[PDB]
Amino acid sequence: ELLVFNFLLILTILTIWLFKNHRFRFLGAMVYGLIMGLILRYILEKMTFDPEIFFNVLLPPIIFHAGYSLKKRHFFQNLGSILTYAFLGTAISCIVIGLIMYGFVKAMVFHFTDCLFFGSLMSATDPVTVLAIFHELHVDPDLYTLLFGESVLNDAVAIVLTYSISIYSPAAFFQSVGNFLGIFAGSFAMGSAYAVVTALLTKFTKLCEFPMLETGLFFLLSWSAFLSAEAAGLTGIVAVLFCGVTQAHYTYNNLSLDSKMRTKQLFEFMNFLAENVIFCYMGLALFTFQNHIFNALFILGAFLAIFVARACNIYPLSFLLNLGPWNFQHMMMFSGLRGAIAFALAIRDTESQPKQMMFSTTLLLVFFTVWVFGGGTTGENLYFQ
Amino acid sequence: ELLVFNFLLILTILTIWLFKNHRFRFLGAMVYGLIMGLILRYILEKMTFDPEIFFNVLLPPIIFHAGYSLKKRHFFQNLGSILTYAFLGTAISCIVIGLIMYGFVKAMVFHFTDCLFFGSLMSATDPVTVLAIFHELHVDPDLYTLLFGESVLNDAVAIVLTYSISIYSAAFFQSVGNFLGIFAGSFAMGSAYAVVTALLTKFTKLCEFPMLETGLFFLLSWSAFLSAEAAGLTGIVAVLFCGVTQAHYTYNNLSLDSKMRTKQLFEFMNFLAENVIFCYMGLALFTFQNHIFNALFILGAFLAIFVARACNIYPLSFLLNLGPWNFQHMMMFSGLRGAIAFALAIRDTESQPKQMMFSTTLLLVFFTVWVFGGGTTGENLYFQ
């Protein structure tokens, strides 16, 4: 694994250079999915040293900046809608299984347990490209906050919800519900406890006179909450650190006054390496030869179902919210990408079932298809408002 | 392994507490490492998993800040004096081998090639505690910049030199060329990436994109370390140290925004050097197969400790007087032993079943020298 890491960096200068050079083009690392892969089709196994378990420990730093960048402009404005969109994860899962179940059934003119697994897997929605486009336009703040809040909550629900399905074993349905509620409640309680401990430590003790000591303690205490989840056996490790929203609510504002900018720059740099996760999408598309061995003709069943499922649970959910404004226009815009986190779930143990491989293959084509919406976003923005 | 890192953080949290309490204490974090091991001793192998190759990849962030923190106030006034201490690593190894050679021969009442490894390894000296004292007191700026000079340079020299004599087996001539060739190639390739970084930020306008140039600087600097290892050029730690020219040119050209961020970001990882400071007791209490020897050869090495830092600086610095120094800084150079020398002793730590004595001996050296470092303010007032 000597020069394997070098290839990750070497291509990344090109990714950095693409953003600066192609700043005004019609339309960064996602472009290399087609051209770059074929040249190396002939080190392939080593470029695959990528360990799934270690993929779920470099993601929490990505999640932390998402929860550390809240502007507190939606806690009393659109928080209720976001909490209403917590049921969207259940809504997407129960509707995706509605159509995809008939998909492979009509293929033969195998169990239902993995059908639920795919539905909960696809529920993640992280339109980072759309959010970046909205931010640079510095417009529609109401849509900016509401969409961003929905994007960081469903994936947190998705990771917790899919685990209970994987351990479903009959009745025993309430056992899976208890595991879902227990893990999610435990993740929030213990995860926020470390943030509270960090907040109270810097609220009374006059440690703010040492900018590095508070900076180092802040990173260690925040990372300890994520680490403690695996030690105690409580799963949802991604959701544990995501609950550090209260960390930016109390610890940031209490007495820092110097590391306020330092915390962002140190942590956004970790989030600035999100192209590595972006690069990993195409990496498993060709390097992991066995992963995409099937590429079966089940795409059309998932292609039609993945958009109609989102279509049939955005307006009805917003219709209920409208009973108790919203411009009646934002629901069309809502339908963005299909989740950055989503890829990691499809690579869980990678061969548990014969169809476990083809879920990743279907997900790979999703990333190669839905990303055109990110490019066709400026035109869509001016189309409506 | 999931909960192994968790126990490292809690003891690392207490390090911040110790440095918080010590504003006026007579005086270090070196205490909790010993205390933590006793609790677990009275989980063992899992705590000290610590892959040997993985120690050399968490080390470069420590070296990078040292080369990036230069005040550019020494290359014009004491550059020659500091470069004269490039032979100090060899000069220390010239006399350390002599005493250690008689240490086991007289005790016996292996071969001398192992003495070379111990002498080259011992030449490292990074008295980070000494620099912290001078900075807080804000005194002796000439002494502060001179001490920082050889302290960080010889660490790279020790790592590159010990490899040549480790494979050395007349045959001594090409070992020097191997040592010189790697060191020469480290400066070329190591500064090659720095030149590329410098020219990119001076011609193309990256000043308007501060969110992007910070990643570019980190990626290019890191790639210098990765390229050296992959290409087969050893002394990869020295290769990243050859990026000292980034602070000379890249840091000053057109950043104007990330100047502070680049310093803080890399210095933040250097603040995580307590893990290196804490990996001693992790291996000094839990690795029962490693440190169980603790042979009665410490006195032979301990006598070599003081004379190594005396038989060289007093003669060599006398030569520099030919072309003041007040004769107080002359004796002050006998500082600490640093923290980089640990990794050279753990190079798979299994060359021979009985030769692992050097790993045992080095661990006691850190404890013995640390208490000497604690009583540094007393020597500061006695001399100056």
Numbering used by the authors:
A (entry chain B): 23 to 49, 54 to 68, 123 to 189, 199 to 259, 269 to 422, 428 to 488
B (entry chain A): 23 to 49, 54 to 68, 123 to 189, 199 to 258, 269 to 422, 428 to 488
Task: Provide the authors' own sentences about this structure as they appear in the paper.
Surprisingly, there was no obvious density for any of the 90‐residue long C‐terminal tail regulatory domain (CTD), likely a result of its predicted dynamics and intrinsic disorder. We repeated cryo‐EM structural determination for a horse NHE9 construct lacking the entire CTD domain (NHE9 ΔCTD), which displayed similar kinetics as the close‐to‐full‐length NHE9* construct. Consistent with removal of the entire flexible CTD, 36% of the auto‐picked particles now contributed to the final 3D class with an improved EM map resolution of 3.2 Å (and EV2B and EV3). After several rounds of refinement with global and local search using ctf refine and polishing, a final resolution of 3.19 Å was achieved at gold‐standard FSC (0.143), with a local resolution range of 3.1–4.1 Å. As model building revealed only minor differences between NHE9* and NHE9 ΔCTD structures, the later was used for all subsequent analysis due to its moderately better resolution. Superimposition of NHE9* (wheat) and NHE9 ΔCTD (core transport domains (blue), dimerization domains (orange), linker helices (grey)) structures, which show only small differences in the most mobile regions. Cryo‐EM density map of the NHE9 ΔCTD homodimer with the 6‐TM core transport domains (coloured in blue), the dimer domain (coloured in orange) and the linker helix (coloured in grey). In NhaA, with 12 TMs, the dimerization interface is instead formed by interactions between an antiparallel β‐hairpin extension in a loop domain that buries a total surface area of only ~ 700 Å2 (Lee et al, 2014). In NHE9, the substrate‐binding cavity is located between the dimer and core ion‐transport domains and is open towards the intracellular side. In NHE9, the end of TM3 was observed to have moved away from the dimerization interface, exposing a hydrophobic pocket for lipids between the protomers, reminiscent of lipid binding in PaNhaP at active pH and the more distantly related citrate transporter CitS (Wohlert et al, 2014; Xu et al, 2020; Fig EV4A).
